[PDB]
Amino acid sequence: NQICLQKTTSTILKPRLISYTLPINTREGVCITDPLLAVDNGFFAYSHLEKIGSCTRGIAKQRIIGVGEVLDRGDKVPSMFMTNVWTPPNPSTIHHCSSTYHEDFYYTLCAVSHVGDPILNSTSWTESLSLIRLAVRPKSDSGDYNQKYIAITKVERGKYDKVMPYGPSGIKQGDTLYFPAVGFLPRTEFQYNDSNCPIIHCKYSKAENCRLSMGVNSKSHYILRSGLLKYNLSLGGDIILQFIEIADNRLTIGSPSKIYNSLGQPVFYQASYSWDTMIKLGDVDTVDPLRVQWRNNSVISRPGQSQCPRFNVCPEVCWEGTYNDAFLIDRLNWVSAGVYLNSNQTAENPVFAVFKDNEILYQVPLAEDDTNAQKTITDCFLLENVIWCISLVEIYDTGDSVIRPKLFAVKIPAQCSE
Amino acid sequence: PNQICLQKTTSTILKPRLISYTLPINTREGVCITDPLLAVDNGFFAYSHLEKIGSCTRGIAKQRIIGVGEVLDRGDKVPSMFMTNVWTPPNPSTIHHCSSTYHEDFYYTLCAVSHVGDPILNSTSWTESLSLIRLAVRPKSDSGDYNQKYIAITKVERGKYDKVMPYGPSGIKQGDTLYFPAVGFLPRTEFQYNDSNCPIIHCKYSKAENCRLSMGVNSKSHYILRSGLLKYNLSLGGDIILQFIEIADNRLTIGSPSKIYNSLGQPVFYQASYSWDTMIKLGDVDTVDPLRVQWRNNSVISRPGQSQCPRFNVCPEVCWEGTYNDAFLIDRLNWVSAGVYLNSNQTAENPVFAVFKDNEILYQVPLAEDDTNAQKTITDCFLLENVIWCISLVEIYDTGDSVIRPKLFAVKIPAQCS
Ligand SMILES: *[C@@H]1O[C@H](CO)[C@@H](O[C@@H]2O[C@H](CO)[C@@H](O[C@@H]3O[C@H](CO[C@H]4O[C@H](CO)[C@@H](O)[C@H](O)[C@@H]4O)[C@@H](O)[C@H](O[C@H]4O[C@H](CO)[C@@H](O)[C@H](O)[C@@H]4O)[C@@H]3O)[C@H](O)[C@H]2NC(C)=O)[C@H](O)[C@H]1NC(C)=O
Ligand SMILES: *[C@@H]1O[C@H](CO)[C@@H](O)[C@H](O)[C@H]1NC(C)=O
Ligand SMILES: *[C@@H]1O[C@H](CO)[C@@H](O)[C@H](O)[C@H]1NC(C)=O
Ligand SMILES: *[C@@H]1O[C@H](CO)[C@@H](O)[C@H](O)[C@H]1NC(C)=O
């Protein structure tokens, strides 16, 4: 299997809107938010928060966490079919979910909070997690095989006060699952030498900017450190979660990340929520301790606001950015594929690009230039011999009754012709 | 060979004392200690509670603790309690209805994991999930798994019932098998009952349907509750399996918190009166499986209720009102029992310890005042040297104390009548 590996300005990329099923309702004045997508081994997982009003200020109505199957039906375009749906009782308590596949089940670790977003009310939030095990091929009358609620028996956080799932999906390594997560370490306990802040090429950048930008605000009580939550399924009835922090190599505030397996080894993506606006992506060198071999990427970034806009590399105290991930599709040329937002300061213009560390080979707009879009989650796979890529794109302020995310299906061309 | 005072006396032969019990120490304020549990067994004890910051009903769950220890006479010629092991589940809000039972060198406690709240108040929403914590009464050094372990229930053989739950403080052991107090959720549509069995012989304002409709939280309740015993055979303990045993038709009452204990050789069973059978339901178990209790013709002990089914109401009405005030058999030849009751027609007040026969209260003593709000009481009695002793945990509420918590008393049964 090979792909087009030459720079073409032609439209060799033709995005198609995938066929996906969901539970049916007749509700109106609704926005589908906090999305999730996790494709693995011909299966998928999907979650969202339904709001009665605006996508920002609406009242929470229904959270659904669902699993299913991706399929080819001779149309040679992937289709999605939901097989199991779980609807928690309290929409407003469920936060930052992350789904990981193993055996015949999707394990989704979510965060329970009665104060609000646990990242914005860190000090007020009391740590609480939840694990939902859903079967991708349900059966009839099998007690706690289709839907099981797993209870954490102990959470090893180490030096960290609180830990929380913070990302859409994770990997498996044998019978041990690794979720994207974040740790809440007090600022006073944070070990950082400002002599390691890269302000040796920046004028108005202070050496203190890196450290102070490791929390939501400069005078925050905690810093945020992205990492992994380990759930060893072979450890009997003790459902123990263990936190694994990321290393200092290109360190940035704890952001939503996603660990995935491709062509053998694992890969890691960390959203650029601070001053390192260029994409953070790379092969995981070690899963424990976590060390990522970030790519020398110079072409793909993310939108920001005023202090840290797109293509900013010099340290500043900021907390801006969007989670737009990318999926390795060829390790020998490190070609990745994903959706990025082609605007400097606003969340607009989604563009599916098959890019390299210093070159966007071919891209294709997924909407118009002033189309508002935010979080993108892209997972790719091999159907027969052709690489296909499913991309969930968050669209907002469409002026519709049921504003929904747009799920795409983009086949990576093999030839650079036509 | 041990003797007890078998005569009625208006004097104060009974002198209660506040027991010394050690718990892990904090210094936080504005807290309520709820969902208590006490179990005494072979000179050992188990204790559980839920710490709530704020209100005793609508407070934020802070700390669930599960504990075991030793009951010893340290020369003060009074029983004392000393904790040896503790476990603090990580999500306190999910732990519900816990039930401890002792075997060999461990206390096994079957709890309920729920994210909808009290499974009895949100029965249709509850997804059955159970937890089992094996704790060592005498811990050893660096002995992981020996000290604290979780026995994932794996299988639950409910039978004709949809959901099953631990619903009672303590249980017994028969050889290598563990019997926990339990409840059983049956959809009304499958509840077999002959309304002609509803005793409305001397109750003019009572219909016959008033018995079948009082077998649920409400008359239209989707589920009826039937108390029983969840079994656990350790002798084949590899892939643990729980098995429900239902209580017989004799004196059927809505599934209420129950207690099975061994006294003077044979098992005894106590069911709370959460419906119109306001009189105490106590008696020797004739057969554990099937569960058959030979309830007593007790005509002196009842429980506070409300307007419909108040204290000393023997007539079938549709009610779900009552408190858990158990009792412990102290003499079988004269069937004398010992426990705490609340002396108020229609309020949870005036806790009163009493040693009582079927149709007579021999001697009794007030524990607090006459207006002290008090709810649940768990009473377990035992023999220290040659003197019968009784430990009663009383739930005391409404005081405004910085730390509201249960009151644990130790009472010596008079042997000769002063
Ligand atoms: C992301 O980008 C970094 C670089 O920015 C990549 O890592 C670098 O890789 C180059 C080689 O490709 C390394 O360069 C080598 O450095 C040796 C020592 O000089 C370096 O010393 C320190 C580290 O020891 C560096 O920090 C410093 O800046 C110097 O660059 C040289 O001796 C080497 O020379 C040898 O090879 C060259 C090339 O053939 C010959 O001409 C020489 O004669 C000699 O044989 C070489 O120049 C560099 O050290 C690496 N940096 C670090 C920090 O490790 C990452 O690989 C890249 N990541 C991805 C995913 O692409
Ligand atoms: C998970 O637990 C099993 C059983 O103790 C062990 O054999 C395995 O190595 C563990 N895997 C880890 C810690 O990654
Ligand atoms: C975004 O900002 C950079 C600043 O270096 C600038 O070079 C670039 O042209 C800007 N892009 C747009 C679309 O304005
Ligand atoms: C409690 O109930 C009994 C029976 O109804 C009654 O005789 C008694 O007077 C009641 N007590 C009070 C204080 O009303």
Describe the structure.
The structure is a homodimer of 418-residue chains. Chain A has one helix at residues 209-212; strands at 16-17, 30-37, 43-52, 59-71, 79-86, 94-102, 105-112, 129-135, 147-150, 154-156, 162-165, 171-173, 176-186, 222-232, 240-245, 257-262, 265-270, 280-286, 291-294, 326-330, 335-341, 350-356, 359-365, 373-383, 386-395, 402-403, 406-411. Chain A is mostly beta strands. In chain A, the strands form six sheets. In chain A, strands 10, 11, 12, 13, 14 and 15 form a six-stranded mixed β-sheet that branches. Chains A and B meet through strand 9 of A and loops of B. Bound molecules: a molecule of 5 linked components (NAG-NAG-BMA-MAN-MAN) and 2-acetamido-2-deoxy-beta-D-glucopyranose (NAG) (3 copies). One 2-acetamido-2-deoxy-beta-D-glucopyranose is lined by residues 309-311, 344 of chain A. The PDB classes it as viral protein. The entry lists the keywords attachment protein, viral protein. It forms a dimeric assembly. Crystal Structure of the Hendra Virus Attachment G glycoprotein (HeV-G).
Helix content of chain A: under 10%
Cα-to-Cα separation, first versus last residue of chain A: 19 Å
Biggest interface, CB < 8 A: A-B, 24 and 24 residues
Count helical runs of chain A: 1
How would you describe the shape of chain A? globular
Radius of gyration of chain A: 21 Å
What does the oligomeric state look like here? homodimer
Helix/strand/pairing category of chain A: mainly beta
Range of strand content of chain A: 35-45%
Succession of helices and strands of chain A: EEEEEEEEEEEEEHEEEEEEEEEEEEEE
Largest sheet of chain A: 6 strands, mixed
